[PDB]
């Protein structure tokens with residue numbers, strides 16, 4: 312049975328609610344993004360209307376085989392009427408195709424559902440500037456002050472400079488980057504660009520990337536591993552064992568691997584600066600964990616909410632324990648007393 316924080320009151324709508332069977336009264340199922348915890352349940356046999364971005368619709372059709380007649384793509388930044396209710400989709404600054412949804416209820420209430428997002432001051436100049444929000448359904452993944460990490464631009468600068476130095480010292484080094492979902496594509500695209508290479512990958516991953524509307528993609532990626540000196544591998548292979556096994560397969564072209572694991576936050580963020588990060592090394596293999604986040608830091612979340620001034624907040628992440636719920640409620644009250652709403 313579908314929980315309450317996935318239902319939108321006064322509508323026939325649900326958000327990210329595909330794992331509960333037929334939801335009673337649901338006339339339209341919204342999907343914020345193509346991550347498996349949020350699409351869980353969708354397959355080629357789904358027969359109700361799905362509303363989403365163009366990019367998420369490309370992934371539902373090609374990767375999950377949902378039939379075309381049940382996919383309803385909407386443009387961003389555009390007022391649209393769905394089953395008699397005005398909605399707008401907004402860029403969530405999460406993975407490709409990820410949206411927030413603004414719902415204009417027939418009774419006059421306005422609701423924002425963030426989906427998964429990385430809050431940014433640019434959101435303060437979207438269509439959100441124009442009117443008030445009564446309820447905010449909020450991605451609270453990192454809602455605690457210990458969760459700090461750098462800008463995506465600082466993290467990319469570290470990765471490009473690290474990879475360019477290594478491969479200029481040793482032209483026979485291979486670079487490998489881990490992946491297990493869409494998102495974080497800038498990591499491997501920026502490294503391949505500084506090296507003057509296409510990125511090489513499995514046919515399955517190539518297929519996924521080809522759904523993402525990235526400009527000039529055909530110039531940036533390939534399935535011909537032998538032509539490329541930046542390879543993508545499943546995240547589960549980014550360890551000394553898996554990397555050894557990969558180097559064997561490269562036919563003596565390479566004598567060293569430098570590998571990247573984009574993570575979210577890790578406890579070494581509570582001590583070490585991006586600049587000071589060092590790898591784990593065994594022999595001719597080095598692995599860097601880099602803190603490339605597509606979710607709000609605590610400070611970015613707090614800024615967004617203090618600017619929006621919602622009347623009520625409903626968390627959508629970390630909802631399963633009393634201790635988490637109580638922590639989040641305390642920070643929401645601090646923020647409100649501090650800013651005066």
Ligand code: NI
Nearest residue numbers: 344346405427
């Ligand atoms: Ni996500």
